[PDB]
Enzyme design. Structure first.
Site, PDB file in Angstrom:
ATOM      1  N   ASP A  16      -1.905   9.380  -0.761  1.00 32.35           N
ATOM      2  CA  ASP A  16      -3.223   8.801  -1.033  1.00 32.35           C
ATOM      3  C   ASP A  16      -3.650   7.578  -0.238  1.00 32.35           C
ATOM      4  O   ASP A  16      -4.686   6.983  -0.541  1.00 32.35           O
ATOM      5  CB  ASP A  16      -3.366   8.502  -2.534  1.00 32.35           C
ATOM      6  N   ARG A  30      -7.545   3.761   0.547  1.00 34.18           N
ATOM      7  CA  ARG A  30      -6.929   4.402  -0.607  1.00 34.18           C
ATOM      8  C   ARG A  30      -7.925   5.516  -0.978  1.00 34.18           C
ATOM      9  O   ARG A  30      -9.101   5.249  -1.203  1.00 34.18           O
ATOM     10  CB  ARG A  30      -6.767   3.380  -1.741  1.00 34.18           C
ATOM     11  N   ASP A  35      -4.625  11.092  -7.639  1.00 29.94           N
ATOM     12  CA  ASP A  35      -3.337  10.481  -7.961  1.00 29.94           C
ATOM     13  C   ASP A  35      -2.208  11.393  -7.506  1.00 29.94           C
ATOM     14  O   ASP A  35      -1.815  12.305  -8.234  1.00 29.94           O
ATOM     15  CB  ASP A  35      -3.193  10.260  -9.468  1.00 29.94           C
ATOM     16  N   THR A  36      -1.697  11.162  -6.301  1.00 29.64           N
ATOM     17  CA  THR A  36      -0.614  11.969  -5.763  1.00 29.64           C
ATOM     18  C   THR A  36       0.724  11.401  -6.228  1.00 29.64           C
ATOM     19  O   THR A  36       0.812  10.219  -6.567  1.00 29.64           O
ATOM     20  CB  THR A  36      -0.642  11.954  -4.233  1.00 29.64           C
ATOM     21  N   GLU A  38       4.288   9.729  -6.167  1.00 26.01           N
ATOM     22  CA  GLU A  38       4.846   8.736  -5.268  1.00 26.01           C
ATOM     23  C   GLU A  38       5.998   9.304  -4.473  1.00 26.01           C
ATOM     24  O   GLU A  38       6.856   9.990  -5.014  1.00 26.01           O
ATOM     25  CB  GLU A  38       5.288   7.490  -6.033  1.00 26.01           C
ATOM     26  N   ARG A  76      -7.462  -2.676  -0.004  1.00 29.59           N
ATOM     27  CA  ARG A  76      -7.564  -1.317   0.527  1.00 29.59           C
ATOM     28  C   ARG A  76      -8.971  -0.765   0.329  1.00 29.59           C
ATOM     29  O   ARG A  76      -9.523  -0.920  -0.765  1.00 29.59           O
ATOM     30  CB  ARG A  76      -6.580  -0.396  -0.173  1.00 29.59           C
TER      31      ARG A  76
END
Length: 130
Positions: A16, A30, A35-36, A38, A76
């Site tokens: 992301d 970002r 929401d990928t 981690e 970001r």
């Protein structure tokens, strides 16, 4: 209405986060509404490989800020990234490599589009959804 702007890929960081040359200045973006996992959570390196591949192979990268706040507390940029017309944000979700994130500070222009895609990915039990 939103508008797309050219950017140049500098370095893909993970699922992301991407680093681009935006307006002559290097900047980390970002991806909005996703929401990928981690990079190591299950499917994290897959989402990174995907994002990385999608942006490194593109002839044209474009960024699109939403109507809400354009940066987060870490500085970001908050936007929708396009790789040759294809929005990376949507592509990740459609492939089941990301969940639709909660709307942040009024940036919700494409939440419905992304929600739909996510439903479809759930339906096909893709990756995160298998």
């Amino acid at each position: 209405k939103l508008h797309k702007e050219p950017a140049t890929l500098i370095k893909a960081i993970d699922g992301d986060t991407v680093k681009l040359m935006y307006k002559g200045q290097p900047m980390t973006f970002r991806l909005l509404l996703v929401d990928t996992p981690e990079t190591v959570e299950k499917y994290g390196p897959e989402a990174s490989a995907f994002t990385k591949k999608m942006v490194e192979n593109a002839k044209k990268i474009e960024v699109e800020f939403d109507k809400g706040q354009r940066t987060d507390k870490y500085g970001r940029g908050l936007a929708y990234i396009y790789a040759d017309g294809k929005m990376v944000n949507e592509a990740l979700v459609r492939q089941g490599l990301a969940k639709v994130a909660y709307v942040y500070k009024g940036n919700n222009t494409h939440e419905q589009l992304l929600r739909k895609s996510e439903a479809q990915a759930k339906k096909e039990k893709l990756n995160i959804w298998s």
